Amino acid sequence: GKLPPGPSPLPVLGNLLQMDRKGLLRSFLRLREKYGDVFTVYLGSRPVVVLCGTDAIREALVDQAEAFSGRGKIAVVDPIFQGYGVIFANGERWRALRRFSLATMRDFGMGKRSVEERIQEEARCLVEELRKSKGALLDNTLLFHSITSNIICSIVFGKRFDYKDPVFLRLLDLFFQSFSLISSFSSQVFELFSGFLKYFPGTHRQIYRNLQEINTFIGQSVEKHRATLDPSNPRDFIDVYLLRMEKDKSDPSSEFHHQNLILTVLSLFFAGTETTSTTLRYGFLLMLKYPHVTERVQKEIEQVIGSHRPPALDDRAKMPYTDAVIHEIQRLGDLIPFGVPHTVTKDTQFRGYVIPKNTEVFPVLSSALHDPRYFETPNTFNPGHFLDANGALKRNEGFMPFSLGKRICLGEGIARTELFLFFTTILQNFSIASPVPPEDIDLTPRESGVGNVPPSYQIRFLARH
Ligand code: HEM
Ligand SMILES: Clc1ccc(-c2cnc[nH]2)cc1
């Protein structure tokens, strides 16, 4: 049936000569200009199909959902996962882990705190910590990585860490350094010649080393959980997984074993810590660049929530402006630019082309979030993209920051609740400022690869009264 159009490759080097030195995303966007919304490019010797624009992505991930439900690989972390854990698994193993992960977080019995309550509690701890800074200028990177890591810790380990805990800070350091390395230029070259470059020194080794040190901490927590498990009262995600292992003792095809336990927990930290945190850091940078918008969010908080009680998730339905602002922070932040690689699960017929089973497919989410066919002046921040004439929230088919289809972000619910409660609880309690004039605020990513990493910046949180 034939593959989608694309630059003729050279053996070994593939399409290296037709790439853009800026990175994989620019390379993909440049090729889209020449070959259309659906093309083939060779990363090293591997052929991959690229889908660009809202329409093409929706046709694949939604209209042929099952076919495009396969998961590809990211070379610098594949040595860690190797097909285990809920993110990088395929087939029955993925189906089983996803179903269990959704159900285990979608509800944690009674007597325990809901996910919304754990986030409100973390937002309260955050407010207390920021009050201690007395409004001094700071870089919010560490605290924003802390609050989102703490939500996953609460869910998986059954508790949060104090912001000044040495264990926590070390773990935080390992993770953050890894995300920066993972979307660095080197990791993107590694994506092309891993088969060859895997044999040499480099950042891919430091990434591996850091993630294994985190897996070691995960393993020791699993042992502590095992040693104190009370079947009558599971405490968190690990206890629930351990109880399922007991339930499946006689099932030789169960996927609930050790490797999927450690790597599913790593998956939830990997995914649950990084993107929500960078979205929040990018959102506050935009709020410094658009003080008028920040002021309107604070006015809506005052009208709907007031200044005494904490924001609750059900306030969001009565706060369309703030909700539109968060949508727009996600849309312009474009935190996972070329998506997380998929693969087709069978030879697939797509737009008159044939995509062979297991071929890697990149749904370039950035090209939908910035799709001119759906968003006027896509490169400019405007909450109005999500608001109708009456100020009510409006949907846009191009808005797919969590992707779409069978692989749609498993943590979407948790992430949206974290964005709404952290953004509103911070702005209800603090006004923000920085020495940089709004006009001079640069939104350009410090690094752009599988993740977009926002630039560092200074900000102050002044307690309100
Ligand atoms: C603003 C925050 C977040 C954004 C924009 C985001 C978005 C994404 C995207 C674009 C994908 C790939 C979907 C695909 O394969 O097509 C993904 C997958 C995933 N995300 Fe997130 N994510 C966020 C937060 C979270 C959180 C908080 C968790 C965990 C609690 C999480 C868990 C996962 C997992 C486990 C997958 C793989 C799902 C599967 O393969 O079935 N994410 N996310
Ligand atoms: Cl390689 C990779 C995989 C998954 C994510 C992710 C999912 N949800 C948030 N982040 C990011 C990068």
Curated annotation (Swiss-Prot):
Tell me which EC number(s) this protein carries.
1.14.14.1
Name the needed cofactors: heme
**EC category:** oxidoreductase
> What induces it, per record?
By phenobarbital.
Q: Which residues bind heme?
A: 409
Record-listed Phosphoserine modification sites = 101
Instruction: Write down the membrane topology.
Output: Peripheral membrane protein
Q: Write out the entry's keywords from A to Z.
A: Endoplasmic reticulum, Heme, Iron, Membrane, Metal-binding, Microsome, Monooxygenase, Oxidoreductase, Phosphoprotein
Family, per entry = Belongs to the cytochrome P450 family.
**Full protein name:** Cytochrome P450 2B4
Q: Which organism is it from?
A: Oryctolagus cuniculus (Rabbit)
Q: What is the lineage of its organism?
A: Eukaryota, Metazoa, Chordata, Craniata, Vertebrata
